[PDB]
């Protein structure tokens, strides 16, 4: 309110704690395994024995969706020269949830936990603020800065989707464990809540911001402490992400798989 | 189709006896107490007939012929307090009274309460 403390700013206090690190330039911690097509790329040939799989896949909700459908998940190959004791972190929806978990349990991974992101629209925030009353600002600079509109009732601020059911405001990330025998998994858990509110953009909700992806990455990193860099991840890193982009993916201790056009 | 008569029909058909009334109306007296501590009219009539059937004062043998369940002695005494109309039960020991004279001296107790000019929620104090 007056001292700049509302419902919105009380739930958006984590944003100032996390700041994106610079691009590593050591040629010791980023692995460039760029191939033409992942479904046409033979996996488990350069990597090995990873413990955190990230699949940043844009799901094909319908025919008009410009993403990758579940048939590209059917053709995925995961074996013992790949994630064996680890955890998959894959973006999931509601329409294809049953098929996603059913086809993942056909590979050995079973569901363990949920971690979603409550979408708060910056456009709705500024529109509500200007209705109550802070102009000439598109939500892009509101994302890039911390100058957020005040809001004590946040249930009005959520994004307006176009679902033919209960409206959609959800970015659930599915976690799937790959229990193995005679190899315990070292975890440092309970360090992060399954829900954090994050600010999104209107008519473009299919992406998390730099700070939100940082939150997810640090969540994975503190969850599994032996997969990040302790003097031994020389080439054979214990964390790998699939699909990627030139935005936030090259990480110290992370194999990055790209998708050539 | 209205939902009032619909609700009365559903309650009259498949709801419990302590939830719906005789015409299907909602028994609201049951829903502001606990679960299992409601005072049913059947329990009321059982207490009324057990007052005459057995001795008074001691409620152990009254609880014997009671529902043999959620029939604690203190609640039986506390509801007989209003049944007969006074709080002093200890001075009424050994007195067997039926329902007609129970209503008679209940009316008498409420009457002497309104003459003594300190009546408090239709209960005469002593």
């Amino acid at each position: 309110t007056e001292p700049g403390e509302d419902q919105l700013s009380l739930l958006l206090k984590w944003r100032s704690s996390y700041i994106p690190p610079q691009k590593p330039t050591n040629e010791d911690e980023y692995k460039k395994i760029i191939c033409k097509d992942i479904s046409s790329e033979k996996l488990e040939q350069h990597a090995g024995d990873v413990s955190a799989l990230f699949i940043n896949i844009k799901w094909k909700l319908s025919e008009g969706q410009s993403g990758k459908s579940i048939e590209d998940l059917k053709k995925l190959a995961i074996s013992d020269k790949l994630i064996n004791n680890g955890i998959i972190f894959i973006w999931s929806e509601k329409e294809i949830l049953s098929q996603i978990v059913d086809v993942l349990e056909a590979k050995g991974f079973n569901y363990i936990e949920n971690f979603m992101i409550n979408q708060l629209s910056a456009d709705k925030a500024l529109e509500m603020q200007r209705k109550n009353q802070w102009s000439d600002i598109t939500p892009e600079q509101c994302i890039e800065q911390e100058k957020f509109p005040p809001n004590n009732y946040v249930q009005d601020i959520f994004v307006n989707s176009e679902y033919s059911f209960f409206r959609k405001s959800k970015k659930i990330l599915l976690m799937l464990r790959k229990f193995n025998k005679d190899a315990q998994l070292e975890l440092r858990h309970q360090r992060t809540s399954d829900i954090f509110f994050d600010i999104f953009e209107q008519n473009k909700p299919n992406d998390v911001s730099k700070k939100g992806m940082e939150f997810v990455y640090k969540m994975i990193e503190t969850l599994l402490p032996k997969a990040n860099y302790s003097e031994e991840n020389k080439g054979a890193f214990k964390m790998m992400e699939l699909y990627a982009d030139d935005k936030s993916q090259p990480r110290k201790g992370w194999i990055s798989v790209y998708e050539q056009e | 189709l209205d939902f009032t008569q619909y609700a009365k029909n559903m309650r009259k058909d498949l709801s419990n006896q302590d939830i719906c009334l005789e015409d299907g109306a909602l028994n609201h007296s049951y829903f502001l107490t606990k679960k299992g501590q409601y005072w049913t009219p059947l329990n009321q009539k059982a207490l009324q007939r057990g007052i005459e059937l057995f001795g008074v004062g001691n409620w152990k043998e009254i609880n014997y012929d009671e529902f043999s369940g959620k029939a604690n002695i203190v609640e039986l005494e506390l509801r007989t307090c209003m049944i007969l109309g006074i709080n002093d039960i200890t001075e009424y020991y050994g007195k067997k009274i039926s329902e007609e004279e129970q209503e008679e001296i209940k009316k008498s107790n409420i009457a002497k309460g309104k003459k003594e000019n300190k009546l408090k929620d239709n209960i005469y104090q002593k």
């Binding site: - | 107490t33 606990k34 501590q37 604690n72 203190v74 609640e75 506390l78």
Partner: protein
């Protein structure tokens, strides 16, 4: 004690039978003293 049964989370009958059992405790204590 006396203040441990006066809770706002306690229904009136439960409170009242607590005080009745508590009178039973005082009655037995006076019987013990006498």
């Amino acid at each position: 004690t006396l203040e441990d049964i006066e809770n706002e989370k306690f229904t009136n009958l439960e409170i009242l039978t607590h005080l009745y059992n508590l009178k039973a405790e005082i009655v037995r204590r006076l019987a013990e003293q006498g």
